[PDB]
Structures are given as structure tokens and as C-alpha cells.
Ligand SMILES: *[C@@H]1O[C@H](CO)[C@@H](O[C@@H]2O[C@H](CO)[C@@H](O[C@H]3O[C@H](CO)[C@@H](O)[C@H](O[C@H]4O[C@H](CO)[C@@H](O)[C@H](O)[C@@H]4O)[C@@H]3O)[C@H](O)[C@H]2NC(C)=O)[C@H](O)[C@H]1NC(C)=O
Ligand SMILES: *[C@@H]1O[C@H](CO)[C@@H](O[C@@H]2O[C@H](CO)[C@@H](O[C@H]3O[C@H](CO)[C@@H](O)[C@H](O[C@H]4O[C@H](CO)[C@@H](O)[C@H](O)[C@@H]4O)[C@@H]3O)[C@H](O)[C@H]2NC(C)=O)[C@H](O)[C@H]1NC(C)=O
Ligand SMILES: *[C@@H]1O[C@H](CO)[C@@H](O[C@@H]2O[C@H](CO)[C@@H](O[C@H]3O[C@H](CO)[C@@H](O)[C@H](O)[C@@H]3O)[C@H](O)[C@H]2NC(C)=O)[C@H](O)[C@H]1NC(C)=O
Ligand SMILES: *[C@@H]1O[C@H](CO)[C@@H](O[C@@H]2O[C@H](CO)[C@@H](O[C@H]3O[C@H](CO)[C@@H](O)[C@H](O)[C@@H]3O)[C@H](O)[C@H]2NC(C)=O)[C@H](O)[C@H]1NC(C)=O
């Protein structure tokens with residue numbers, strides 16, 4: 001007569017894209033739409049029991065989250081888990097819910113290993129995956145003549161969820177699975193100045209197609225040093241792996257978009273540097289249902305969660321929880337419609353997998369693996385104004401690169417430089 | 427009136443040094459000695475509740491073990507946990523018991539990260555630690571003039587606890603913490619022939635002091651190929667990181683000790699190869715209490731566990747569980763003796779730490795970090811017979827290398843070859 | 853710190869190495 005949904009997310013820390021202050025109202029919106037739909041679970045009253053994935057210091061935890069999962073499992077026996085989104089929170093909870101035969105839905109947990117559904121059985125990811133970033137990079141290389149060698153630089157903060165490691169792992173593994181080109185990689189520490197000579201030297205020795213996963217300021221400083229050392233768009237292209245657009249404002253207003261601008265008298269040098277720099281991000285959903293969802297999310301979070309949802313790419317995570325939840329209720333209702341129960345985890349999961357769906361994020365396709373296909377945008381500088389704008393768009397389901405507003409990807413040489421220089425790297 | 431000890435180990439799989447078929451009788455011996463001692467917990471009846479750390483396939487599991495820990499914790503509220511011994515089993519259980527404020531004792535879990543006691547609080551290791559291997563390697567290098575460069579080759583089997591990775595991590599991190607020399611490393615796959623050209627080439631380009639953590643046969647085959655390619659004891663020294671002596675028989679009988687002997691007509695070639703090879707193992711305890719313990723362990727395991735305890739270095743793990751359990755009962759009794767309770771985890775733990783103790787393994791020192799100091803033997807070939815025998819011994823608490831039975835470590839040149847060649851590696 | 857060693861104990865951070873020197877993966 002009612003469905004129990006267990007949530008394991010950050011209930012107090014609001015710094016995460018999947019924090020409850022931001023996912024909670026998106027889930028309330030989805031529950032309210034289930035109530036108003038007589039074709040989704042007619043008569044059922046879907047209840048929610050919450051559990052915090054964060055430890056005593058407030059950050060998501062490989063210990064708090066699995067404990068919270070056990071507490072909710074024995075206290076409420078839920079039919080489905082929601083979250084966590086942190087990789088190190090989601091992995092132990094994922095293995096528990098796989099063993100419990102309970103479906104797990106999350107718009108976080110994008111790590112390569114969560115994709116091994118032989119272990120993470122009945123785990124369905126409705127947000128981005130880092131292997132899907134490898135799909136985009138693959139198409140980018142095929143559609144640009146780079147079939148030899150790339151270099152990847154990544155840096156994390158000690159004690160975090162290692163976002164850049166997992167981003168780079170997804171890119172690295174998928175790209176070599178599909179292209180088998182030489183992908184050199186190097187980790188650094190952003191606050192450690194010792195690494196910048198090593199990095200700059202490694203840039204001019206290990207690649208010309210260069211991906212950097214780092215903070216905006218680290219990517220900026222790395223660009224300034226590359227200009228100061230004479231590395232320009234004629235030989236080098238620097239992709240910033242900024243999937244959440246941290247180095248850019250939201251697509252709503254704040255025209256124009258300038259990541260090189262900082263107000264330290266270096267902005268003039270930074271613009272000429274960023275002439276060699278392109279930014280890879282998630283794609284902002286276009287559909288007007290998204291914008292309406294954003295307005296309702298902001299209202300409901302300010303009312304019931306005392307939180308202010310700013311605009312930005314990070315909002316695709318609460319939108320994907322929203323969409324994932326509706327996609328699950330559809331599947332349960334379909335499982336009930338053919339004689340199943342709310343605990344037929346495998347039947348429910350297979351109805352959700354290899355399936356297209358329409359949600360506030362627009363068209364969303366769960367692939368055969370149970371992971372949502374992920375669309376990416378490519379930002380580039382207009383050499384006239386100097387501002388960055390989307391010039392290429394990647395559809396994850398069809399793996400197509402489509403030009404955007406008839407724009408041209410800027411090249412100082414008129415075309416992309418070769419991924420290997422003239423007479424070797426020497 | 428009674429003390430509850432929770433055990434999380436392999437209750438069914440008997441392939442592990444810390445399997446219950448082997449640790450269970452050692453614990454029964456220790457409980458029987460607590461009962462017969464009126465100075466250890468007088469009147470208390472130490473109870474034991476078991477939990478299997480292995481999954482459905484029988485191997486130790488990063489899911490079964492933490493789940494089992496939760497079951498025992500809420501059903502019995504034990505005052506202490508025993509095990510797990512697998513690294514991936516022990517890490518999640520360790521973070522649970524740290525959070526539960528419950529002490530944990532194990533002779534397994536030797537990984538570097540378990541040593542971070544800020545996270546693994548109240549975790550006491552009474553068996554070996556892989557950083558202690560790094561101590562022995564440090565002393566070996568100082569007492570031999572190697573202060574420049576070493577190479578480390580390691581291989582694991584996909585899906586195991588990665589024993590060689592963690593051994594090499596402990597060695598790598600501690601050695602560079604103390605000597606800051608260049609430690610090159612390379613992982614291979616034992617069954618993959620593509621790697622043996624790569625390894626042999628890396629041997630003759632990345633080092634002359636060469637440590638290999640692998641199976642006996644892989645180490646043997648690598649030696650045969652090094653002889654075939656003309657790498658002899660004049661320039662190279664190959665240490666086999668065989669801490670449990672898997673490539674050697676037990677120290678009880680089976681005289682003599684021949685690891686290069688296999689019965690494939692290659693044994694003639696293997697002996698000349700192994701002239702460049704030395705084997706690093708844990709130290710067999712000397713004291714006669716150990717031999718009496720071994721006899722009693724074998725009897726009790728055959729009687730109550732239907733298991734046959736063969737002789738060998740792996741028996742130091744059940745012996746250390748034994749010793750750690752007695753070392754804990756002392757601390758509880760001392761905590762009770764000064765007004766504490768059996769749940770004063772931090773008081774009990776600090777009585778155990780920075781403390782020397784006498785057990786069936788002889789002298790055992792728990793260091794300031796809560797980890798037992800580990801003694802190592804070094805085996806070497808007698809050039810006359812070709813058999814291997816202990817020639818050096820490392821006391822972990824004093825960090826001294828003492829020669830053994832007036833033996834001399836064999837060198838084809840009369841002294842150790844230089845860790846760096848003449849005019850570089852080119 | 854280290855590029856290969858010291859990075860937590862979970863099979864999730866051992867799916868590619870990527871800081872390590874390996875012939876597999
Ligand atoms: C990224 O690439 C994906 C791969 O192609 C795109 O998926 C496609 O999405 C479109 C719509 O968004 C979808 O079209 C049809 O889907 C239904 C299933 O086949 C079909 O029944 C529909 O047809 C009905 O409605 C139309 C009017 O819309 C009528 O004219 C018809 O007579 C019929 O009544 C609809 O045409 C494709 O099937 C789907 N392709 C695949 C392979 O899934 C994504 O849309 C694209 N995303 C973006 C943002 O570009
Ligand atoms: C590895 O090195 C360790 C570090 O040196 C050694 O530890 C030493 O172990 C010895 C005994 O094994 C220990 O000796 C004394 O320990 C007591 C504490 O100080 C002390 O009270 C003892 O003295 C009593 O007994 C003797 C007879 O044994 C009498 O003559 C005395 O009058 C007294 O009544 C005992 O002498 C050291 O203290 C200890 N040193 C440290 C720094 O801990 C390990 O033994 C060694 N292991 C191996 C296998 O070599
Ligand atoms: C909400 O979550 C934030 C990110 O998860 C968190 O920010 C970060 O806070 C940690 C402290 O937990 C900082 O780091 C330190 O972590 C360990 C634990 O003390 C130390 O040993 C390290 O040396 C390091 O100093 C991070 O630097 C910090 N990161 C950022 C980007 O701010 C917030 O603190 C959390 N807030 C609340 C209220 O829970
Ligand atoms: C007792 O434990 C032994 C070691 O923990 C175990 O041996 C090993 O068994 C596994 C199977 O679980 C073999 O490996 C395979 O692991 C996964 C899971 O199927 C596969 O995907 C891999 O490709 C791989 O084939 C190991 O090779 C094997 N190792 C050894 C040294 O034998 C025993 O099977 C366990 N026995 C019982 C009764 O539980």
C-alpha cells in the first residue's frame with residue numbers, strides 16, 4: 001500500500017551537487033508528480049526514510065554511508081535506495097544493496113568501477129558517467145585526426161572524493177579501449193609549486209593534445225606559464241576537463257563568459273594564453289521543462305530546505321535524481337502491471353535498462369549497462385571578443401558531434417595541430 | 427561476568443594463513459590458558475561469537491566481512507574484534523570498529539593504510555606489517571652500501587587481496603621515507619608472456635638491486651631468463667619477497683632447502699641462476715614454547731576442526747593471534763585492576779601499545795603505533811651444495827642485522843655489486 | 853604522498869592503476 005525509499009546522501013553539508021538541500025526538493029517534486037499521476041503507482045503513498053552519508057566532520061564518508069545503509073535496511077526494509085553520489089560512499093553501499101537484492105538509483109557515483117554491474121548488481125546510474133567522457137574524447141579524436149598520443153594532467157585535494165582521478169580513469173580506460181592510442185598521464189598537487197616545472201616540462205615532452213583536470217585557477221596558472229614559455233595554439237591544445245563548468249558562470253545570464261578574467265592585472269596575458277584552451281563540460285539541458293523545473297526547484301528548496309539553489313551545471317544532478325525516480329516508479333508500476341511486486345529488483349531494473357525516457361532533462365537513454373548516456377558541450381574562445389561559447393555538442397546516445405549555432409572551433413593555424421610534432425618530440 | 431569476543435575471519439575457506447581452521451584452535455589454546463591463569467580475568471568466562479568474512483564463492487570479501495561485523499555488533503555488543511586478516515576485509519571492518527569505539531586485534535591486515543591509526547583507531551596489529559619490511563630493506567641497504575637506486579617487480583592474480591601490491595607499497599613508502607633513494611617499480615601479470623621481454627629489459631635498465639614479489643615459479647622463470655640473457659651475481663642481486671616462504675619447505679625437516687629444484691631438467695640451469703638470488707622471509711620463531719605451541723595447535727585443529735596444520739612460516743599468523751589475544755586479556759585485567767571496564771577501549775589499547783610481551787612467538791614488541799615489530803630472515807645459497815639457508819637475521823625492535831651461524835652472504839665478486847653500474851645504465 | 857601508493861583501501865580505486873607503472877590494464 002506504500003513504497004519505502006531509502007536515501008543515503010549528505011543531509012547537512014550543502015556543498016555537494018547531490019546534497020539533500022538540493023536533491024530533497026527535486027525528489028519532493030518527483031513524489032508530488034507521482035501523486036498527481038493516476039498512471040504511476042495508483043493508490044500507493046511513497047514514503048522516504050533519510051540517512052546521512054557524511055561523517056562527523058561533514059564530508060561524505062566511506063564509513064557513515066554504509067552504516068546508514070545498514071540502519072535503514074533493518075529498520076524499514078526499503079524497496080530501493082537513493083544515493084550516495086560520492087564514489088567512496090557509493091561503492092560500499094552499492095555492494096551492500098547488490099547483496100541485499102535491492103535496486104539502487106543514483107545520479108552520482110560516476111566512477112569506472114561502479115560500471116561493473118556484475119558486482120554492482122541492480123545499480124542504475126541516471127547521471128553522468130566518466131566512461132561516457134571517454135566516449136566524447138574518442139569522437140573528438142576521430143573527428144579531428146588525433147590518432148597517436150594524448151597527455152592527461154590531473155590533481156586532487158588530499159581527503160576529497162578524488163574527482164579528477166576518477167574522471168581521468170574513466171577517460172583513460174574508455175579511450176584506450178576504443179582507440180588504443182598512447183595516453184600519457186601525470187598527477188600533481190595544485191598547491192605544490194615544485195610540480196609546475198615538472199608539469200610544464202612534461203607538457204613539452206609527453207603530448208600535444210593535453211587534457212587537464214584541475215581547479216579553474218590551476219588551469220589558468222598552467223595556461224599563463226605555457227604562454228610565458230611559448231606554447232601556443234599552433235602546436236598545443238589544452239582541454240580543461242571542467243565537467244561541472246566550475247570555471248564558467250551559469251547559462252542563464254551573466255553575459256558574457258570569461259574564465260581567464262580574474263582582476264589581478266594578469267587578465268590581459270590570460271586571454272592570449274586561453275587562445276589555446278578549450279573547455280569540456282556537461283551539456284545544459286535545452287528543453288523548457290528543465291527551466292520550469294529549475295524555477296520550481298529554487299522555490300521548493302528555499303521554502304522547505306532553507307537553501308538557495310543557484311544556477312549552474314551542477315543542477316543536472318538533482319534533475320537526474322528527479323528523472324531517475326520517475327523512471328523507477330514507471331518501472332515498478334509496469335512490474336505491478338504484469339504480476340510482479342515492488343521487490344522484484346531484477347525485473348524492475350531490466351525494465352529501466354536499455355530504455356529511452358523523457359524527463360525534465362529532456363531525452364535520457366539508460367544504456368544496456370544501466371548507465372545514462374551523457375551529453376557533453378565543448379566551449380571555445382571567439383578570437384574577436386575573447387569570450388567562451390559552446391561550439392560543439394556531443395549526443396551520448398548517438399555519439400554525434402554537432403556544430404552549435406554554426407560556430408567554428410577556433411584554431412590559430414586554421415586547423416587542429418598534429419597530436420605528434422614534426423621530427424618526434426625531441 | 428563474561429567477555430564477548432567477536433571473530434570475523436574465513437570460517438570455511440582453509441587456504442588463508444588466518445583461516446579459522448587454523449586460527450580457531452590457536453584461540454582455543456589461548457582461552458584455555460586464560461582459564462588456567464588466576465592472574466588473567468579471574469572468574470570471567472570469555473565468550474566467542476563467529477562471523478565469516480568470506481563471500482558466497484568462499485574468498486574473503488570487502489562486503490561479507492563488514493556485514494558480518496554489523497551482525498555481531500548489534501547482536502552481541504562485543505568488547506573486542508578478532509580479524510579480519512585480508513586487507514580488503516579488514517579496511518571496512520576497521521573503520522566500523524574505529525567508529526564503534528571497540529578495539530580490534532588482528533595478525534593480518536598488514537597494508538600501509540591500516541597503519542594510519544587516526545583512521546583505524548584502536549586497531550592493534552600483532553602480526554607482520556609491510557612497512558616493517560621497509561625497515562629491513564632500509565637496514566639491508568645501509569649495511570651494504572646501496573644508497574642510490576633499486577627496482578621492484580610485483581605481480582598479482584586478478585581478484586585476490588593483492589598481497590604483492592601491498593607488500594611492495596609498504597616497502598616502497600617506508601624505504602623512501604628513510605633513504606629517499608630512487609625506487610623504480612613495475613607491475614606484471616604472471617601468466618602473460620608479453621611481460622617477460624618488458625621485465626627482462628626493465629631489469630637491465632632500471633636497477634641492479636632488484637626485489638621481486640611473485641609466485642615461486644614466476645621468480646624461478648625470471649631467474650632462468652636472466653641467466654640465459656647473461657645477468658649474473660657480479661652485477662645483479664635478485665631478492666625474492668617471499669615473506670611466507672612459499673618457495674621453501676618448513677624449518678622442521680625436509681633437509682635440505684632447494685627452491686630452484688623443480689624436476690624439469692631445468693634444475694641444472696636454475697641452480698646457476700639462483701647463484702644471484704636471495705630470499706627474504708619472515709623469521710621462524712626460535713623459542714621452544716613455539717614448537718610446543720605448534721604440537722598443541724596441530725592436535726587441537728585435527729581434533730576440533732577436522733583440519734591438518736602442516737608446518738611452515740604461515741603458522742606465525744595463528745601464533746600471533748594467540749599471542750595478541752593473551753596480550754589483550756592482560757590489558758583488560760590491568761584496566762579492571764585500576765578501576766576501568768572492559769569497554770575502556772582507549773585505556774586498554776594504550777596499555778597494549780609501546781609494550782613488550784612474552785608469547786609463544788617469543789619476544790614481541792608492540793610499537794608506539796600499535797603494530798608488532800617484525801623480524802625477517804635472509805636466505806642465501808651455499809655455493810658448495812646449492813641449498814639455501816638463513817645467513818642474516820633482522821631484529822625488528824632493535825633494527826640490527828646479525829649474521830646467523832657464522833654464515834657469509836655469498837657474492838660471486840666477493841662483495842655486493844654496486845646499485846648503480848659504471849658509466850650509467852647505458 | 854605517492855602517485856601510485858597510499859590511495860585508500862577499496863577495490864574502487866584499483867580498476868586501472870593510472871598512477872602506477874603497469875603492463876596490465
Ligand atoms: C540524441 O540521439 C538520440 C539517438 O537518435 C535521439 O533519440 C531519438 O529521439 C527521438 C525524439 O527525441 C526519437 O523519435 C521518435 O521516438 C519514438 C520511438 O521510436 C517514436 O514513436 C516517435 O514518433 C512519434 O511521434 C512523431 C512526432 O514526434 C510522429 O511523427 C510519429 O509518427 C510517431 O507518432 C518519435 O518520432 C527517436 O526514436 C530517438 N532515437 C533513438 C535511436 O532512440 C535523441 O533525441 C538525441 N537527443 C538530442 C538532444 O538531440
Ligand atoms: C630484539 O631486540 C630487542 C631490543 O633490544 C630485545 O629486547 C630485549 O629483550 C631482553 C630479553 O629478551 C630484555 O631484557 C630484560 O628485560 C626486562 C625489562 O628491562 C628486565 O627486567 C630483565 O631483567 C631481569 O632478568 C635478568 C635475567 O634474564 C636478570 O639478570 C636481571 O637482573 C632482571 O632480574 C631482562 O634482563 C630487554 O629489556 C629488551 N630490550 C628492549 C629495548 O626492549 C629482544 O629480546 C630481541 N629479540 C631477539 C629474538 O633477539
Ligand atoms: C562540506 O564538505 C566540503 C567538501 O567535502 C568540506 O570542505 C573541505 O573540508 C575539509 C575538512 O573536512 C578540508 O580538508 C582537510 O581534510 C582532512 C581532515 O581534517 C585534513 O587532514 C586535510 O589536511 C585537509 O586540511 C578540505 O580542504 C575542504 N575543501 C574545500 C573545497 O573546502 C566542508 O568542510 C564541509 N562542510 C561542513 C559544514 O561539513
Ligand atoms: C578459498 O580461497 C582461495 C583463495 O582466496 C580460492 O582460490 C581462488 O579461487 C578464485 C575463485 O573465486 C580464483 O579466481 C577467479 O576469481 C574471479 C571470480 O570468479 C574470476 O572472475 C577470475 O577470473 C578468477 O578466475 C583464483 O584463481 C583462485 N586462486 C587460487 C590460488 O587457487 C579458493 O577457490 C577458495 N575455496 C573455497 C572452497 O572457498
Ligand SMILES: [Cl-]
Nearest residue numbers: 053084085086
Ligand atoms: Cl554521498
Ligand SMILES: [Cl-]
Nearest residue numbers: 479510511512
Ligand atoms: Cl579475513
